Structures are given as C-alpha cells and as structure tokens.
Structure 1
C-alpha cells in the first residue's frame, strides 16, 4: 500500500536535496528556509512511512504462515459454501420436479 508512496517520498527527498545543493549558491535566506522545510518534511514523512509500513513478509516465514492460514480458512469456507450450494441445488431440483409434475397434469 505505502510502498510506492515511500518510494516517491524518497525520490522527492533526493530531488529536493539536489535542488537545494544547486540553488544554495532576503532571497537566498528565504530559498534556503523553503528548501530546509521541504527536505525536513520529506525526510520525516519517509521515516514515518518506513516505520508504519507493513512489518511482516520482508523475510520468508511470516508471509508464508499468513498465506497458509488464509488458504486453510478459504478451504473451510469453500467446503461450507459447497455444502450450502448443494443444498440449494437440491431444493431447486425438487422445485423443478414439482413444477414439471404439475405441468404434466
């Protein structure tokens, strides 16, 4: 979710740092203050995004365990849904047989 967000934040921080390094050398003071505010906000946002990012499947075990649990839950739900669909199809077949018998009269 925040992956591309943090990527764009880091890119914008690097671009702002380069622009500040290029424009560093009260117009000068105001430009330096604006570049400082921009760079500080970008760095703080990047840090907060990296801290509040998804702390999970960076390695290879937590993501695998979560996927296995999700697959087990999905299999149980699919079995329940198959039972329910079989019951509904049986009811529909009974209704269709009753309708055919009524029409045969």
Structure 2
C-alpha cells in the first residue's frame, strides 16, 4: 500500500514533467495528459484518505502485547494439557490393539 502510494506520488510528477516536455517539443496529447494527471491525483487523494490519524501503538500497544503474552502462555498450557492426555490415548490404546493382535496370533 505505502509503496503504491510512493509510486503514485512519483508518477503524479511523471505526468507533470512529461506534460511540460510534450508542450516544449496535438490537442489529443494535452487532453490525455490532463486526464492522466487528474486521474492519478484523485487516486492519490483516495489512497491518502485510507491511512488514518491512528492512536495507541504503545499505551494500548504495550497493554495489548502484555495481555497477548499472558494469553499465549495460558493457551500453550491448555493445548499441551490436552496434548499430554491426547498422546496418552494413542500410547496404550495402540497397545490394546497389540494385545488383541497378540491374542489373535497366539491362537
């Protein structure tokens, strides 16, 4: 987005330089140049109308990152506690399938 904005600002100038160059160097050229400049100018305006005044970024940034660290810790604990017990299932339930297999082979 920001790279597009910089390129658009640089091009806004491109159509100025190019316009004046063409002039020094017929009516359709000036018409298309004018349309080009106006189009890209309006695009730069509507693109600037995007990035905001903005706020926080620290006060709220710091608070949010601290809350996120706490919640990441608690979520890691929850996912592991589930995981120790999840892996527990496969551990001796596959040994229950091996007990069945041993009893079938012993026959």
Contact 1:13 1:42 in 2 (8 A): yes
Question: Could you give the per-residue CA deviations for residues 20-77 of structure 1, whole angstroms, max 9, x where no partner exists?
Answer: 121123xx33222211111111111112112213664897666555555555554444
| Structure 1 position 11, deviation (Å) | 2.3
- TM (normalized to structure 1)? 0.68
Larger Cα-atom Rg: 2
Cα 1:98–1:75, aligned 2, differ >3 Å: closer, same or farther?
same
Instruction: Give the Cα–Cα distance (whole angstroms) in 1 for the partners of residues 33 and 59 of structure 2.
Output: 42
The answer for unaligned runs of 5 or more in structure 1 is none
Q: Give the direction of change, closer, same or farther, for the CA distance of 1:63–1:13 in structure 2 (3 Å limit).
A: farther
What is the RMSD of the two structures over their aligned residues, measured on CA atoms? 3.0
SS in 1 for 2:55: coil
TM-score, normalised by the number of residues in structure 2: 0.67
Structure 2 unaligned segments of length 5 or more: list them: none
